[PDB]
Amino acid sequence: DTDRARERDRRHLWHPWSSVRDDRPILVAGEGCRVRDVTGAGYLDAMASAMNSSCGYAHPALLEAARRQLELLPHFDLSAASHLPAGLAAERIAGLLPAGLERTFFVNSGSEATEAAVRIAHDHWTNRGEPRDRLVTFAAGYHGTTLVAQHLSGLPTNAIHGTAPFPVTRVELPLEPAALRTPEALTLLADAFERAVLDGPPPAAVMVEPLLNVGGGVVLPDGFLRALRALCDRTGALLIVDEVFCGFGRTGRMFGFQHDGVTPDLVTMSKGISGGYVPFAALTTTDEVYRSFAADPLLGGLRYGHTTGGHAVACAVALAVLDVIEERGLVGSAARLGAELLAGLAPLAEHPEVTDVRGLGLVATVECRQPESAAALVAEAKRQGVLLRQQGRAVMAIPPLVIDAAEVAELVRAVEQAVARL
Amino acid sequence: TDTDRARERDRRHLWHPWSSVRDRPILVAGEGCRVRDVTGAGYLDAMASAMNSSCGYAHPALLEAARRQLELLPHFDLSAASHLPAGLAAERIAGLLPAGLERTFFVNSGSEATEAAVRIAHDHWTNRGEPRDRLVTFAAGYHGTTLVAQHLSGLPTNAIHGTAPFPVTRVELPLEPAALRTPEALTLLADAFERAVLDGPPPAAVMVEPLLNVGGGVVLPDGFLRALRALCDRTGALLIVDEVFCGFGRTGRMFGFQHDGVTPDLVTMSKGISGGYVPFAALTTTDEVYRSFAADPLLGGLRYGHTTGGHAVACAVALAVLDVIEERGLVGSAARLGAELLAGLAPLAEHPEVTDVRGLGLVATVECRQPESAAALVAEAKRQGVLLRQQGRAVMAIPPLVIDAAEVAELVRAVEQAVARL
Ligand SMILES: Cc1ncc(COP(=O)(O)O)c(CN)c1O
Ligand SMILES: Cc1ncc(COP(=O)(O)O)c(CN)c1O
Ligand SMILES: [K+]
Numbered sequence: 001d002t003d004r005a006r007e008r009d010r011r012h013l014w015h016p017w018s019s020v021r022d023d024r025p026i027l028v029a030g031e032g033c034r035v036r037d038v039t040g041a042g043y044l045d046a047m048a049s050a051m052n053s054s055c056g057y058a059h060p061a062l063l064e065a066a067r068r069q070l071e072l073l074p075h076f077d078l079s080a081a082s083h084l085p086a087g088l089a090a091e092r093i094a095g096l097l098p099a100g101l102e103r104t105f106f107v108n109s110g111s112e113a114t115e116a117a118v119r120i121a122h123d124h125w126t127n128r129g130e131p132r133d134r135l136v137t138f139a140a141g142y143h144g145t146t147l148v149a150q151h152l153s154g155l156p157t158n159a160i161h162g163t164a165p166f167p168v169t170r171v172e173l174p175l176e177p178a179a180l181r182t183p184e185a186l187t188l189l190a191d192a193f194e195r196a197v198l199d200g201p202p203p204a205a206v207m208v209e210p211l212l213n214v215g216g217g218v219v220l221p222d223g224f225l226r227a228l229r230a231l232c233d234r235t236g237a238l239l240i241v242d243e244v245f246c247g248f249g250r251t252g253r254m255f256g257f258q259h260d261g262v263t264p265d266l267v268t269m270s271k272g273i274s275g276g277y278v279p280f281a282a283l284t285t286t287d288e289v290y291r292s293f294a295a296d297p298l299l300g301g302l303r304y305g306h307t308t309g310g311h312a313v314a315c316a317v318a319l320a321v322l323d324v325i326e327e328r329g330l331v332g333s334a335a336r337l338g339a340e341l342l343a344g345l346a347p348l349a350e351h352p353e354v355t356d357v358r359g360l361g362l363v364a365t366v367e368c369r370q371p372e373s374a375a376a377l378v379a380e381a382k383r384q385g386v387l388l389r390q391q392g393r394a395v396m397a398i399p400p401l402v403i404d405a406a407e408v409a410e411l412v413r414a415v416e417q418a419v420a421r422l
Numbered sequence: 423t424d425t426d427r428a429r430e431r432d433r434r435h436l437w438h439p440w441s442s443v444r445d446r447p448i449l450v451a452g453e454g455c456r457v458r459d460v461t462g463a464g465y466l467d468a469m470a471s472a473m474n475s476s477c478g479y480a481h482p483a484l485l486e487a488a489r490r491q492l493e494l495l496p497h498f499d500l501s502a503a504s505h506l507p508a509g510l511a512a513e514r515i516a517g518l519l520p521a522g523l524e525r526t527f528f529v530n531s532g533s534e535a536t537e538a539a540v541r542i543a544h545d546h547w548t549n550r551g552e553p554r555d556r557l558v559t560f561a562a563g564y565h566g567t568t569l570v571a572q573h574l575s576g577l578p579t580n581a582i583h584g585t586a587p588f589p590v591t592r593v594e595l596p597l598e599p600a601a602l603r604t605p606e607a608l609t610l611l612a613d614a615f616e617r618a619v620l621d622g623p624p625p626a627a628v629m630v631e632p633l634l635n636v637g638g639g640v641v642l643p644d645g646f647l648r649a650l651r652a653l654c655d656r657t658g659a660l661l662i663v664d665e666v667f668c669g670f671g672r673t674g675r676m677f678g679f680q681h682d683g684v685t686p687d688l689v690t691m692s693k694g695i696s697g698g699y700v701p702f703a704a705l706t707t708t709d710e711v712y713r714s715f716a717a718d719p720l721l722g723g724l725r726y727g728h729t730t731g732g733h734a735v736a737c738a739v740a741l742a743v744l745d746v747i748e749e750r751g752l753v754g755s756a757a758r759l760g761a762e763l764l765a766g767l768a769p770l771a772e773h774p775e776v777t778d779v780r781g782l783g784l785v786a787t788v789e790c791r792q793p794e795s796a797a798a799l800v801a802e803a804k805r806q807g808v809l810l811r812q813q814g815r816a817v818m819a820i821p822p823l824v825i826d827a828a829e830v831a832e833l834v835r836a837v838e839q840a841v842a843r844l
């Protein structure tokens with residue numbers, strides 16, 4: 001059986017983001033923040049399954065919501081019909097966002113949310129009789145895996161397989177991530193984005209994460225998004241914030257953008273929204289953007305949509321996730337336990353192979369000098385009983401939001417033990 | 423007042439897919455082939471929820487499979503780990519496909535499957551040291567809603583929001599769909615695709631559906647895919663068959679391409695694979711294509727992947743779907759009952775307003791002379807208690823594969839009554 005399982009994987013399964021050339025762990029069961037492999041070895045899962053297990057494994061509220069809705073109605077095509085969970089989820093998600101962010105479109109993944117967002121930005125300007133094709137982004141940003149999503153990024157492995165479908169101006173970090181959390185760095189960042197925005201005709205949108213995930217758990221200086229909000233007002237560009245990773249408590253606020261206290265024009269969301277239990281993603285925008293689509297000549301609406309976008313089970317699970325977050329105070333717990341986590345790890349920056357320790361809420365990153373060190377850190381933490389996420393030179397701790405104080409201490413100890421062996 | 427509140431929150435907060443900005447039934451529960459709205463009215467659901475409920479609503483085997491896996495492990499990141507459902511599903515899907523199709527990549531939607539398939543096609547040629555950028559498609563084809571997927575289509579509402587990321591040669595239908603089922607139509611289609619393939623440097627791939635869904639339930643003549651197989655074999659282009667709609671029994675074979683009896687180089691799948699119960703999609707290709715990715719200079723593998731691609735609950739549900747399809751013989755049932763459905767509808771072509779009646783298995787279409795007639799037909803059928811899908815001029819019946827002879831007769835009677843009132 002173990003022979004056969006390894007063999008069917010080797011022969012038939014194509015893994016994402018992996019080389020064709022140690023065996024991978026086979027995970028089989030989880031409970032709370034712990035997960036177990038096929039040999040019975042147990043681990044604290046400090047990568048939250050796929051950076052999205054906001055409520056941990058086998059959460060009874062999420063399980064029951066899924067079961068109830070699956071039995072009733074898994075979905076129905078929302079193009080010419082509706083269902084009750086889509087209405088509830090659309091209302092509830094709008095309710096968590098600033099005034100004016102009221103209109104929610106559902107898709108399956110963060111990449112599809114990016115696809116819809118970029119279409120909405122371009123088409124909005126067409127609808128207004130003033131076409132704009134250009135977007136401004138971070139070079140170190142990651143917005144998904146489809147051609148349009150990858151085109152927004154300047155990360156080397158995101159090189160696209162065609163030619164550019166529209167112009168993008170990708171802003172490089174003006175300092176190393178370790179030095180980005182100062183007032184001096186805010187000035188450099190704001191001015192770099194001002195130059196990018198004013199380089200040629202006004203852009204359709206500026207699209208950024210509030211904390212860069214795949215780009216290395218990069219924490220931005222206070223005021224950066226506020227500076228972008230001002231730039232967008234001056235130029236007309238839509239401010240799009242990608243909350244796919246930061247959304248729903250990850251950083252110790254309901255959304256990453258709330259640390260700066262800005263109101264975006266469009267927000268994308270996925271990951272923690274459904275606890276990872278059903279594929280689900282969403283975007284929310286303004287009534288002005290929405291209503292502009294009455295000018296679309298071909299349909300009189302947005303020419304976008306997926307078969308399972310707005311899946312009823314996904315919507316029902318998301319509502320249960322939001323109930324758990326609110327009932328248990330997971331946003332506040334993430335802030336408080338997050339502070340403990342970061343404080344526990346911070347002294348490891350004294351180690352010669354550790355360049356920086358940085359984070360916000362329940363994302364924390366140990367940046368090593370080389371990827372080789374990062375891989376060795378991750379391997380030793382695994383030996384200590386803790387699963388972490390490697391991202392090039394960065395090692396990231398991204399636990400379920402239901403993590404407790406004892407488990408945070410265990411996480412810190414494992415990372416200390418790993419750094420000692422570097 | 424509950425229903426009023428529901429309609430109001432939808433109107434205020436929900437952005438529907440593929441819809442005009444400027445009312446809709448609210449479906450609340452289903453069982454087998456029947457669904458009920460919020461007012462209590464019941465219908466035979468002859469659009470299978472979202473053209474994807476292969477096993478109908480509240481199927482106990484699928485419900486149990488979802489419950490069991492959700493409780494164990496909803497997913498884990500497949501980039502550097504594995505889980506047992508992904509290995510099982512990869513093997514099982516490959517086993518249903520012809521010899522040589524062995525390597526399966528998982529994504530959430532048909533649109534993502536197209537994104538991955540086009541990247542694979544382009545990157546495969548780069549890996550070989552002979553870059554090829556061009557694809558050949560049907561202008562009336564539909565492959566999804568993201569920019570790349572829309573670019574493959576020539577349908578007017580799929581106009582993209584940027585410029586072409588690669589060249590596409592889109593073949594127009596040489597005859598109306600009603601005249602496309604003959605040996606003369608085969609000659610015209612084969613010759614048109616030959617001209618497209620030989621127009622300029624050899625293409626990377628030829629990508630087609632085996633029966634055009636969104637293009638109007640268009641049935642292609644016997645031998646068309648065999649002609650494309652020879653053209654791909656002549657020029658080296660990859661033969662990509664889009665089975666997102668036709669896959670898993672819909673046309674009375676396990677795959678739509680099996681009517682012609684060809685071996686594609688890559689097949690995309692979604693819809694019926696998970697019964698609609700969890701968002702799920704897949705693609706399967708050859709070892710020749712797979713192993714070429716060792717030459718990728720940035721990763722040594724395919725630079726693609728989604729957070730929830732290979733979702734364990736989705737995989738476990740797909741395994742249960744395949745068990746139901748096989749145990750119940752739904753492929754052959756769809757062939758036989760589908761032939762009875764088409765034979766029941768066929769005399770309606772005598773009506774002045776009906777220009778064709780066409781189908782294969784459990785997709786059947788009544789083509790009207792104008793969209794207004796099609797809309798009227800759908801509306802009267804709904805009054806008779808049957809839900810059908812409008813696709814421009816085309817009215818489509820796409821029931822769950824578990825439909826029985828009595829329900830087929832109900833379906834035929836509703837459509838007869840509808841056509842009588844045109
Ligand atoms: C900020 C951000 N945006 C978009 C995505 C893409 O989401 P998916 O993998 O669900 O397509 C990710 C995935 N890591 C992300 O971190
Ligand atoms: C043949 C075909 N390919 C791809 C897609 C796109 O799939 P999705 O809606 O799941 O993105 C569809 C959707 N109708 C389809 O019919
Ligand atoms: K709001």
Ligand SMILES: [K+]
Pocket residue numbers: 516517518519520521522523524
């Ligand atoms: K095979």
Ligand SMILES: [K+]
Pocket residue numbers: 771772773774775776777778
């Ligand atoms: K006629």
